[PDB]
Amino acid sequence: HRIRHARPSDLDALCALEARCWPAPLRASRAELLRRVTTEPRGCWVLLHEGAIVGATYAQRIAGPAALAGARHSELAGLHDPSGAALQLLGLNVDPAVRNHDFGSLLLEFVLAAARLRPGIENVVGVSRCGDYPRQRAKGLGYEDYVHGRGGGPRDPVLGFHLGHGARIGGIISGYRPEDVDNDGAGVIVIHALR
Numbered sequence: 001h002r003i004r005h006a007r008p009s010d011l012d013a014l015c016a017l018e019a020r021c022w023p024a025p026l027r028a029s030r031a032e033l034l035r036r037v038t039t040e041p042r043g044c045w046v047l048l049h050e051g052a053i054v055g056a057t058y059a060q061r062i063a064g065p066a067a068l069a070g071a072r073h074s075e076l077a078g079l080h081d082p083s084g085a086a087l088q089l090l091g092l093n094v095d096p097a098v099r100n101h102d103f104g105s106l107l108l109e110f111v112l113a114a115a116r117l118r119p120g121i122e123n124v125v126g127v128s129r130c131g132d133y134p135r136q137r138a139k140g141l142g143y144e145d146y147v148h149g150r151g152g153g154p155r156d157p158v159l160g161f162h163l164g165h166g167a168r169i170g171g172i173i174s175g176y177r178p179e180d181v182d183n184d185g186a187g188v189i190v191i192h193a194l195r
Contacts, residue, residue: 040080045110086121087111087118133183
């Protein structure tokens, strides 16, 4: 394994990794993937396995956790605040063929460790999602109750990824990502406190 900063040359691999991790409606464009790496150059990392980019994390520095209120998924570049006290996770992709390596938790704990070494960063936040909500929507369960685990069943795997490491839920953004039908267009704010 080897983790390094993302470079504009990795764009073809970052798009290839994006296509394996997400279906067509949920894929970032080549322009957006380039927008992230060039806007926050020292805030994006790639994970190399067998000489290939099997993992990628994007992030930008914004004002704080409150800046995500009523934010759309596509209209996120405007939040960039280089003097802000919080680092926003724009994405964390791990190739589906390397899931048994637990590389996902490695990239997350790497970002959390790198953010605690940058002066001024107080929180690592992001707008997560639910991977198995439609099975609960058919049971009558609401999104907010399912997200907060008040339904009785186990926590959502995509949310439990951040909850398991130490993230607390910071709210739900209605209509955050209208093409994310499995989440009813919603988005869950997770907050990784650092101190």
